[PDB]
Amino acid sequence: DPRPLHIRRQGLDPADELLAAGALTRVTAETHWMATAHAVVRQVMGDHQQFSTRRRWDPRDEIGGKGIFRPRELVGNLMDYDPPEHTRLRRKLTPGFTLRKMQRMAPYIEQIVNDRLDEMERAGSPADLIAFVADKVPGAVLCELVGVPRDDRDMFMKLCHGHLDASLSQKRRAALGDKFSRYLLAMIARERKEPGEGMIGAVVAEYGDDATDEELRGFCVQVMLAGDDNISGMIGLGVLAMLRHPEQIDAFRGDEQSAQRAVDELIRYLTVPYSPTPRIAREDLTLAGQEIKKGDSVICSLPAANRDPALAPDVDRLDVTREPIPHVAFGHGVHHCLGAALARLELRTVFTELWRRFPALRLADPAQDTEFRLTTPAYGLTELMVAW
Numbered sequence: 001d002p003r004p005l006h007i008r009r010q011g012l013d014p015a016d017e018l019l020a021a022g023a024l025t026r027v028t029a030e031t032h033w034m035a036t037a038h039a040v041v042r043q044v045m046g047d048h049q050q051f052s053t054r055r056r057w058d059p060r061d062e063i064g065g066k067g068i069f070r071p072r073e074l075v076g077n078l079m080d081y082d083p084p085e086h087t088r089l090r091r092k093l094t095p096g097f098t099l100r101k102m103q104r105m106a107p108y109i110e111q112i113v114n115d116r117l118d119e120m121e122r123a124g125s126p127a128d129l130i131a132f133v134a135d136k137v138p139g140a141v142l143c144e145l146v147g148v149p150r151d152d153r154d155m156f157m158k159l160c161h162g163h164l165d166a167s168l169s170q171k172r173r174a175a176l177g178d179k180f181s182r183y184l185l186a187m188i189a190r191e192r193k194e195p196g197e198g199m200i201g202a203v204v205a206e207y208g209d210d211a212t213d214e215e216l217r218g219f220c221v222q223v224m225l226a227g228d229d230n231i232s233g234m235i236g237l238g239v240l241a242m243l244r245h246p247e248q249i250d251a252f253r254g255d256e257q258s259a260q261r262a263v264d265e266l267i268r269y270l271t272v273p274y275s276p277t278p279r280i281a282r283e284d285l286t287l288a289g290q291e292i293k294k295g296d297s298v299i300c301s302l303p304a305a306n307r308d309p310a311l312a313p314d315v316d317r318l319d320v321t322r323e324p325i326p327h328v329a330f331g332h333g334v335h336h337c338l339g340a341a342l343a344r345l346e347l348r349t350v351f352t353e354l355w356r357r358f359p360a361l362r363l364a365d366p367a368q369d370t371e372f373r374l375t376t377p378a379y380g381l382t383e384l385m386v387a388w
């Protein structure tokens with residue numbers, strides 16, 4: 001198998017050979033170190049003093065390229081920086097993700113979720129949950145967060161992705177980029193004139209001109225690219241995982257805390273991101289017994305780390321009622337997922353509304369093959385036929 005070891009999955013789990021890899025070992029056509037132990041991953045990611053994030057990195061680089069990011073060194077990209085610089089940028093974008101801001105988004109996320117569910121219900125059982133829900137809700141949620149008018153969301157999605165879609169002609173990508181920046185600049189101007197509750201309005205309300213247009217543009221794109229695939233992947237695999245353990249669906253038929261715990265567990269169990277941004281040792285050091293030399297690259301396997309046998313004797317099982325396990329699916333350290341609360345809220349809303357609307361949800365065909373999404377930076381499904 002030519003595909004990198006950290007990219008291999010078996011069903012909803014990490015490949016056996018990935019799970020069998022040592023805590024920290026070398027892998028290969030550049031070569032890097034690979035961290036699979038929970039403690040090691042936490043050490044590498046939490047110590048920004050010795051492991052800086054590899055500036056200008058693409059979560060794809062393989063067979064595909066169809067619909068993937070294009071950095072070009074984008075200012076305002078939290079990932080391309082480290083403290084104290086990172087701390088400055090982060091603090092600047094934080095106003096849009098406060099928990100109070102997230103609580104207020106709850107009602108809107110529900111509205112969006114129900115609107116997609118309405119379209120699926122109208123199509124009749126059986127239907128593809130991925131086409132109707134998983135692939136639609138994330139982007140709409142992000143548009144709502146950013147402050148994009150409801151009627152411009154479809155257009156905005158096309159312009160955002162399009163101006164970064166390599167598979168497109170240069171004439172097209174450039175036309176889409178022109179319109180994109182133009183639209184973005186006009187949105188930014190309106191937010192500075194009269195700040196709204198959106199991400200941009202929150203930032204400009206707090207820091208005014210200190211937040212330049214370039215920064216805001218950078219923030220928007222970065223956020224648009226960071227919160228889509230991860231979520232669509234979680235919705236699809238998440239529903240599949242729950243349908244395979246139907247008794248655990250009761251965690252979504254009760255209080256909020258119970259739904260929250262289920263979501264956290266699903267996020268740990270499925271760990272859609274294969275790995276975070278590569279970490280580069282800023283000096284020579286000895287980790288997990290290995291001799292790391294300045295300039296060495298370290299790839300962290302979040303899925304393997306979240307299956308570390310040290311975490312629990314049944315860490316390999318899905319158990320929404322288990323004693324919560326501090327997973328690393330959102331990362332660890334100063335770069336910890338800025339949209340983690342939103343992701344948890346969004347995913348809790350989807351699952352709760354889903355099973356409330358379709359109590360008898362099930363796979364259209366018990367023996368149907370699973371259509372895994374293998375061409376994206378995050379694991380997921382391309383299709384999932386369900387009946388109710």
Ligand code: HEM
Pocket residue numbers: 045053078079090145222223226227228230231234267272273275276277278328329330331332334335336337338339340342343
């Ligand atoms: C279940 C879904 C999600 C997962 C599993 C996830 C996971 C991650 C991981 C592992 C990192 C850290 C990367 C690193 O340290 O190199 C990260 C960073 C980040 N995520 Fe997410 N993410 C999710 C959803 C979202 C959403 C919905 C948004 C946006 C609303 C988002 C915004 C970000 C941003 C901006 C960062 C960078 C923070 C920084 O560098 O300081 N993510 N995410």
